[PDB]
Amino acid sequence: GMTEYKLVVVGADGVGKSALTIQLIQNHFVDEYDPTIEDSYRKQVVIDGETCLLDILDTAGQEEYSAMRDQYMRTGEGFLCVFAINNTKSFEDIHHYREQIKRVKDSEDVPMVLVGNKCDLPSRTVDTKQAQDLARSYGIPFIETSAKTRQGVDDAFYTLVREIRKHKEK
Ligand SMILES: CN(C)C1CN(c2nc3c(F)c(-c4cc(O)cc5ccccc45)c(Cl)cc3c3c2ncn3[C@H]2[C@H]3CN[C@@H]2C3)C1
Numbered sequence: 001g002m003t004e005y006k007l008v009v010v011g012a013d014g015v016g017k018s019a020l021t022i023q024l025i026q027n028h029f030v031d032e033y034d035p036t037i038e039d040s041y042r043k044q045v046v047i048d049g050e051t052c053l054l055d056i057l058d059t060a061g062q063e064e065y066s067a068m069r070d071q072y073m074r075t076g077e078g079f080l081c082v083f084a085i086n087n088t089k090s091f092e093d094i095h096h097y098r099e100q101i102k103r104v105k106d107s108e109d110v111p112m113v114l115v116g117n118k119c120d121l122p123s124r125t126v127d128t129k130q131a132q133d134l135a136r137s138y139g140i141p142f143i144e145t146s147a148k149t150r151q152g153v154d155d156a157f158y159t160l161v162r163e164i165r166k167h168k169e170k
């Protein structure tokens with residue numbers, strides 16, 4: 001049938017996972033969306049001429065490591081790894097998310113994009129170069145976004161779909 005892509009948005013609390021997801025799905029900026037709610041949403045889009053379905057898992061809740069969690073995360077075909085440019089701790093957390101993704105996928109090569117969100121803010125602690133260097137070390141794209149203004153949002157998601165397509169051709 002129509003190609004579906006299962007995308008999972010990961011990262012620390014407060015980085016803008018929900019705001020990014022809601023911009024893609026519902027085309028507006030939502031402030032203070034319940035931080036605890038993990039949910040998924042589908043949207044039909046055309047990317048490079050392909051009509052496809054994006055199923056997006058917007059992660060939330062406590063740090064916990066069950067068999068059920070591992071099984072659910074393994075359903076993801078590609079991962080947005082999100083930090084906020086004003087939050088160094090959120091950047092430092094990326095390594096952990098990448099390692100957990102590789103663990104559950106049982107692969108060194110999982111489609112992923114590094115996303116630096118909140119690029120509309122003046123209060124930046126993570127420079128563009130630090131993030132580009134990390135992404136280069138992982139062999140993945142880096143995209144700066146603002147869920148507030150919608151800068152980079154489509155690019156982030158569509159780049160992840162392109163990473164999935166490249167993986168399928170290997
Ligand atoms: C050592 N802690 C202080 C760090 C904070 N962090 C978190 N790791 C999480 C994690 F690895 C998984 C995790 C477990 C697992 O079974 C398999 C996974 C596969 C891929 C990615 C994460 C997985 C899940 Cl489900 C949640 C994690 C998490 C952490 N801090 C907050 N959380 C929650 C909020 C913000 N991110 C999520 C929503 C490590």
Ligand SMILES: Nc1nc2c(ncn2[C@@H]2O[C@H](COP(=O)(O)OP(=O)(O)O)[C@@H](O)[C@H]2O)c(=O)[nH]1
Pocket residue numbers: 011012013014015016017018019020030031032033034035117118119120121145146147148149
């Ligand atoms: N200025 C700004 N605020 C943002 C942006 N994305 C999210 N926020 C705000 O940051 C907070 C956390 O966002 P949220 O989407 O709940 O993050 P999540 O915990 O990762 O789901 C909220 O107050 C949002 O309004 C962004 O790109 N720019």
Ligand SMILES: [Mg+2]
Pocket residue numbers: 017018019033034035036037058059060
């Ligand atoms: Mg959220």
